[PDB]
Subunit: 223 residues, 4 copies
């Protein structure tokens, strides 16, 4: 009865309109999540979150009754609804952590969108390449964060006060973001940074064409 | 009679020279558009814009009489001529908006150039990929603009005063531009930015090879 | 007699050693060109440049006598020797211009190196793509330098005082260098910059795979 | 006897567990290397390095007795153990140089990891491309570091005081890192930088697809 309505968006006009509200409520909740942090708004933002939560719970229980937890879609629905009920029952770090989780509302759009599902499949099918990329980046960062520290220990006015403190700079230079908050001053540090830029470029460039190929294959096969 | 002259640049020497003036007037109008904003120039810039407008109107009406509005080329011609007649007839935001539209003179070069037409066709044939890229970038930005805000709410001297205020930073880091006007200060914010750089690199890298392939196909087929 | 010695580096051991001095003198001249500008050195740098010039003139005249000007290699040799004789015969802008030309000594290494010759051939065979890239970059820069100026004319403390003054910023953002000396301040300027980054990324990405393919073809065919 | 245990990680459960300690000790030594530079720690860090050194010496001598130096793996083991014995026997520049070498502990993970071995093989098989890339980058840097100096010698407040001093800026701009500590001020310097950005982009882009192809071939053949 309701399973066809909530699982066949193209079966009938009654089911087609339902998905529109399903997307509108998600977008409204996402919008209202960001506006609570604006200083100008330091009651109206709670009576609408309550309706959004009620709609999410109804949408979950309708498909829960008419059968489940082995797929990723149902897991996301449960996570999106938990944080509201926790704060109704009732350390600041725990409060910030449970407030941050609310951001997982954006992942409920994956049931409607197809490109996001393709991206998820591509991410699932390319774990080894991502691990290799992280490994190479860590090796390069730890290799380049010590040379720049040892090549500028003579100067009393150097930003790099320790090897860990030079980690940030390294990941800034290898990714070519270049914020510029920390820069080498001596000649040897400049040579180290010049080598670091090229090494980071090559390290980032090497793994990507495999993930790109997997995404292209999935996108072309699905569409 | 005049249709062959104004639509066959290689038919005769009389038609070939006409296109030269057609390009020279466009370039002169583009040049004169920028120089009105220089502080040194705070009359000479109006009596030449009038001649440019007269030439544009003549060029439009010659092909309008000898036949139309279903193509994009004729639409651009109408837009390029409207703003002059509006200000002759006679709120500051409306004035700035109608002054900004004048910049559409540069698109009249598409009738003469071929690579710009190829670029337009490629843009037309790859709407879905551009939409997917924008979707992925928005998802990543909204995902990373809240973690960095929640990981630095303890510090009283943090730049990120709200989740929307951290949008800019995010799009600066994911695109690897790295202006450096806003940077994370705490350890957790630095970890968030380190993850954000890689995520933005991958997100930007994934969609492009399809638009690149479409442009290559169009460029090779046309030329 | 001398033509075989000066044109067959692998014919004999006598000719093989000659090229070593030919490279050493070029490298020494390049090194001595940069060190004259160091503040510490504000006579020794002239008596060695004289010997370098004498060797260049001898190397030119040996192959000039035993035959010519239709190739690019002989043109570079003449340019490298002219600036010394001009200053011996005897407005500050002309002096700086004729002093800057001396930097063309580095191009004499193209006769010995092969990868540089391959790069030159690739550059010669891909003029149209470079022109198209420059055209697209100019169009994007002129398009984005006016919107950011018109979207921030209200603020009295904006860096962008004119449309030309916003050219620099634009080419900084489209190339993703991001120096950070000029940044948008208002919301609309930030949106304009966010669009500009993506537009520049796509514009730069589109033309390159043709020049890359030409270079790969030449490199694989030669080697 | 012990050769099978120390060279066949998958032969038996006794050999499988040994590699776990071999990785744990390496990771612990790497971690303890960085924490000595933290200002908070200005004895505990020596009695654990001693155990790490003892384990490394034992692991080396077990495979040394049961046979050698022609491979790269055995060379790395010797280098990792030398610096400890040098300081036990007993100019500040020599001390910093011999302290910096300790960072070579990270390369001992290559015996266990496979992707790092693939990366090493790819680096070995692509020496010519790396040399060509370095050559092109040096040519571009020396070409662009003199034009920007000669185009801004008129201004008394220019950062570029000499041609060598402008090397850093150049390698910052060609790699698109853009720290922003040194920027051109005059119009001509800005034009030079605008050309430099594009030239560096093309120069970096040209060599890479060969190293990428070699890495892809090795990764697909091995796995
Ligand atoms: C960051 C920016 C955005 C990143 C990521 C945003 C993407 C969020 C998840 C994508 C939607 C989930 C989804 O559609 O499930 C599908 C994927 O099939 C799977 O089971 C894989 C699960 C998702 C992969 C998560 C790995 C994250 C690794 C670390 C990645 C970091 C299955 O659908 P079905 O089989 O059709 O039923
Ligand atoms: C792949 C690596 C990606 C990214 C690696 C870069 C990590 C973020 C850099 C933060 C620097 C930092 O924390 O400075 C505060 C000092 O350092 C500390 O006191 C604790 C830092 C431990 C973080 C270790 C992460 C892996 C680094 C190894
Ligand atoms: C920004 C930098 C420059 C970007 C863009 C600069 C390019 C401006 C337009 C290109 C010239 C227009 C043109 O030649 O029409 C042709 C394209 O055929 C079409 O009908 C497509 C219309 C143009 C696509 C605009 C989509 C913009 C999407 C959002 C894009 C953002 C038809 O010609 P014909 O068929 O031969 O007759
Ligand atoms: C794809 C996203 C591309 C780009 C997304 C980045 C948008 C530009 C960032 C501007 C930040 C800003 O406006 O700060 C002023 C505060 O914010 C506000 O008061 C209003 C901002 C609303 C803009 C929403 C755009 C989509 C963001 C979601
Ligand atoms: C900037 C970084 C370095 C850029 C460039 C550094 C490269 C300098 C020139 C390369 C060496 C010249 C050369 O070897 O001639 C060969 C090329 O055949 C030609 O005739 C093409 C001439 C050189 C192309 C110059 C176009 C510059 C366009 C604008 C480019 C900007 C012929 O040799 P042969 O046929 O074997 O006899
Ligand atoms: C491809 C474009 C590449 C690069 C285009 C970027 C050009 C460099 C930007 C310099 C900005 C500048 O000069 O500011 C001083 C004000 O402007 C002037 O007074 C004169 C500037 C005229 C330069 C016109 C070049 C093409 C710009 C159109
Ligand atoms: C910087 C970031 C990280 C860069 C580099 C980190 C990688 C460090 C070395 C890789 C592990 C070494 C190795 O596994 O040997 C294998 C490679 O076969 C060789 O003999 C090549 C030797 C290593 C190449 C070093 C060239 C460095 C050039 C300059 C490069 C700069 C042989 O193993 P096997 O044949 O199976 O026995
Ligand atoms: C490939 C080139 C890669 C990178 C080339 C960039 C090299 C790092 C730039 C350092 C600038 C510098 O040292 O300023 C102090 C002044 O200069 C000196 O007093 C000595 C500098 C000599 C370094 C020569 C290296 C090759 C430059 C030619
Ligand atoms: K950058
Ligand atoms: K960059
Ligand atoms: K930057
Ligand atoms: K910067």
């Amino acid at each position: 009865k309701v399973w066809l309505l909530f699982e066949y968006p193209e079966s009938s006009q009654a089911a087609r309109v339902v998905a529109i509200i399903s997307v509108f409520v998600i977008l409204l909740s996402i919008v209202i999540f960001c506006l609570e942090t604006l200083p100008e708004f330091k009651d109206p933002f709670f009576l609408i979150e309550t309706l959004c939560i009620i709609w999410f719970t109804f949408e979950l229980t309708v498909r829960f009754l008419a059968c489940f937890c082995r797929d990723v879609m149902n897991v996301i629905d449960i996570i999106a609804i938990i944080p509201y009920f926790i704060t109704l029952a009732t350390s600041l770090a725990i409060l910030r952590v449970i407030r941050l989780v609310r951001v997982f509302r954006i992942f409920k759009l994956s049931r409607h969108s197809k490109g996001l599902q393709i991206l998820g499949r591509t991410l699932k099918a390319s774990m080894r390449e991502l691990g290799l990329l992280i490994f190479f980046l860590f090796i390069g960062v730890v290799l380049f964060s010590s040379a720049v520290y040892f090549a500028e220990a003579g100067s009393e006015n150097s930003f790099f006060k320790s090897i860990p403190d030079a980690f940030w700079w390294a990941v800034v230079t290898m990714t070519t973001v270049g914020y510029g908050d920390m820069t080498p001053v001596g000649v040897w540090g400049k040579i180290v940074g010049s080598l670091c830029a090229i090494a980071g470029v090559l390290t980032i460039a090497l793994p990507v064409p495999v993930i790109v190929s997997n995404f292209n294959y999935f996108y072309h096969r699905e569409t």
